[PDB]
């Protein structure tokens, strides 16, 4: 969902 989507877009690195 959207709030989790947002933190992924902020923080995700492989």
């Amino acid at each position: 969902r959207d709030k989790k989507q947002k933190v992924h877009a902020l923080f995700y690195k492989a």
Partner: antibody, heavy 126, light 111 residues
Framework: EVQLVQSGAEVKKPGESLKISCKGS????????IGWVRQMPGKGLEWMGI????????RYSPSFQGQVTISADKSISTAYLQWSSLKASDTAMYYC???????????????????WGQGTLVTVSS | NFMLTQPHSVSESPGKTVTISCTRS????????VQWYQQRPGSSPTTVIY?????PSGVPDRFSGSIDSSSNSASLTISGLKTEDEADYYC?????????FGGGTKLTVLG
């Protein structure tokens, strides 16, 4: 034994440059974001910015953007906060922290500050 | 874009179930994740709640967190207040994915 260990207290005058450090041990330094937080004396926490040591991807709070430099030296497992010209207003306690959690583009993923450095006291005065 | 507002002080005796509110001034509080930090006097801060309601492993079970969309506020609740809970508490969320902090709340355990 995950450890974020910040450098010693600093006493400085306006105009001087300063670089403080935050060293991570007990884990893979390049796999977790390191955040920087300011606390002026008697005041609340402020976010300064954050850096991923793997690629030196760096984000800044608008309040601090261009006022301070955040860098990292993956070979040394160290993150840094840097000024070229300190102001007496920069007197604060500085905290680094690791954004831990589970780094998966997933419903299962999450991110939060799970370890903090002990803080570095910067005192700027004439 | 928005301020996060907390009560300056809240004070209760131990045993109590006590809440700290965190009100967003513009935009739905439900739009971005809310974190809570505890900072004891002269100590570094620690995270007691993340993603609105998640409790980190070492944080005591008495800590929980929720959202109240009708007050546009988030809440940290301590069920069975203890003396070691005396601290400043800060809520935080995200603007342009820039982290916004609440002003902080001084929580006194009337001992």
């Amino acid at each position: 034994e995950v450890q974020l260990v910040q450098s010693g207290a600093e006493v400085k005058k306006p105009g001087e440059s300063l670089k403080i450090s935050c060293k991570g041990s007990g884990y893979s330094f390049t796999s977790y974001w390191i955040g920087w937080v300011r606390q002026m004396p008697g005041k609340g926490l402020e976010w300064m910015g954050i850096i991923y040591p793997g690629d030196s991807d760096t984000r800044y709070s608008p309040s601090f953007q261009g006022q301070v430099t955040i860098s990292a030296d993956k070979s040394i497992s160290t993150a840094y906060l840097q000024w070229s010209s300190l102001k007496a207003s920069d007197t604060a306690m500085y905290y680094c922290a690791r954004l831990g959690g589970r780094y998966y583009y997933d419903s299962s993923g999450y991110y939060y500050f799970d370890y903090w450095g002990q803080g570095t006291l910067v005192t700027v005065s004439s | 874009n928005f301020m996060l507002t907390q009560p300056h002080s809240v004070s209760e005796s131990p045993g109590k179930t006590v809440t700290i509110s965190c009100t967003r001034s513009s935009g739905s509080i439900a739009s971005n994740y809310v974190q809570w930090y505890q900072q004891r006097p002269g100590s570094s801060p620690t995270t007691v709640i993340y993603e609105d309601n998640q409790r980190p492993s070492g944080v005591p079970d008495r800590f929980s967190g929720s959202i109240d969309s009708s007050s546009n506020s988030a809440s940290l609740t301590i069920s069975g207040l203890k003396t070691e809970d005396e601290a400043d508490y800060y809520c935080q969320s995200y603007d342009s994915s820039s982290w916004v902090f609440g002003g902080g709340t001084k929580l006194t355990v009337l001992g």
